[PDB]
Design a protein around this ligand. Sequence first.
Ligand SMILES: *[C@@H]1O[C@H](CO)[C@@H](O)[C@H](O)[C@H]1NC(C)=O
Ligand SMILES: [Co+2]
Ligand SMILES: [Co+2]
Length: 434
Amino acid sequence: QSACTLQSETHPPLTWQKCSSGGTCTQQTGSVVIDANWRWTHATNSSTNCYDGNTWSSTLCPDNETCAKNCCLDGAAYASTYGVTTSGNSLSIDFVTQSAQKNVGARLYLMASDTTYQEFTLLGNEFSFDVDVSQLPCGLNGALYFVSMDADGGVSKYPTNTAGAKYGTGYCDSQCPRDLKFINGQANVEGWEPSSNNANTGIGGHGSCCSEMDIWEANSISEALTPHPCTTVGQEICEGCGCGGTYSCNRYGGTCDPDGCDWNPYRLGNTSFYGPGSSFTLDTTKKLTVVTQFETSGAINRYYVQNGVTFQQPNAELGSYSGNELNDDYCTAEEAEFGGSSFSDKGGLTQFKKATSGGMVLVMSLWDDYYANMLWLDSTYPTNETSSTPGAVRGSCSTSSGVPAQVESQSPNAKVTFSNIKFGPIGSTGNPSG
Ligand SMILES: *[C@@H]1O[C@H](CO)[C@@H](O)[C@H](O)[C@H]1NC(C)=O
Ligand SMILES: [Co+2]
Ligand SMILES: [Co+2]
């Protein structure tokens, strides 16, 4: 797709700290850009939509190539249309924003320049950030994570994509998403099937795969840390059901691990660690600091800070595993006790280490779940299971919670705020910011 300018594109600025082993941190200046799927896609020489509702223009987009040639992505009014705002080192994303039309959430990427994404090499370093999830009820997911995307959004590999990172192209994750309207410089109209429960989305014949490090997926009820390896580390297109993931006719069999080795304190047994109010170790009605360290062994460590008090990830005992470090033993024990073989089939932490050793793009989003109502994060899932089933309960939310239309109608003002991002060598982000 190309880029049009009927609507100007001004990326909300966002600063962050780059810390060094020497003990000091220096401020960096970047910005955020919204993913291409949220944009208006229209004809290059007119205002005629190439995509509207959940279907494509049969005339402008008869096939993927013709569609990309005839269509362009336009600018985004971040605050008025998407409910996205920033202030210094803080970023806020509203849930439902009403303008001429209704918008739900957003997916944003941190940029290095107005035309390139900021790449981070996680291995050997740690990532710290503050978050306010107080306004996130059951069914919502305020997420901060990393994916192995190209810094240019795919332009160098696919010249038919001239919009690039400036317009949020090139997304990919461990679900090998097929809902993307443009992949590899081509539209995804071929094989497109409108969503049965979402008037704005659909699934196409192509998907976009790549490694995914879900540092933070949570709401005021539950939170999870989850590495997702793929046999091909970076962004790579996939065909139909062979894509795997939630969309496909079979979530497995693809090149990526859609499940991942997840660590949810509640799911592991400590139901008093994270929640709303003073009855929990971490009070989700108040802002908290989340630090994630990627040691060179490939294992992941985590600690939290709230009101000046530090808490390491709570210990968990599963099978023969005992500890609070997300390592090979934990992941293998999880599969043995909770079931599944996706994470290990895709190479586990050894394969994932290939992703963190390379560059990954920072993603921050807010979304509700049109496939599983976010029950996998904050409720009992599958819903027919009980606490007697290992790992079935992940949160205190009712198994009836999270219906998109309902939470969108009831909690339109929900929101998430990410702030004070700090990145640097392990043990360095706690020092004074620049
Ligand atoms: C949960 O984790 C916190 C922090 O590690 C700990 O202080 C508390 O005792 C744990 N509670 C339970 C029930 O495991
Ligand atoms: Co194809
Ligand atoms: Co970890």
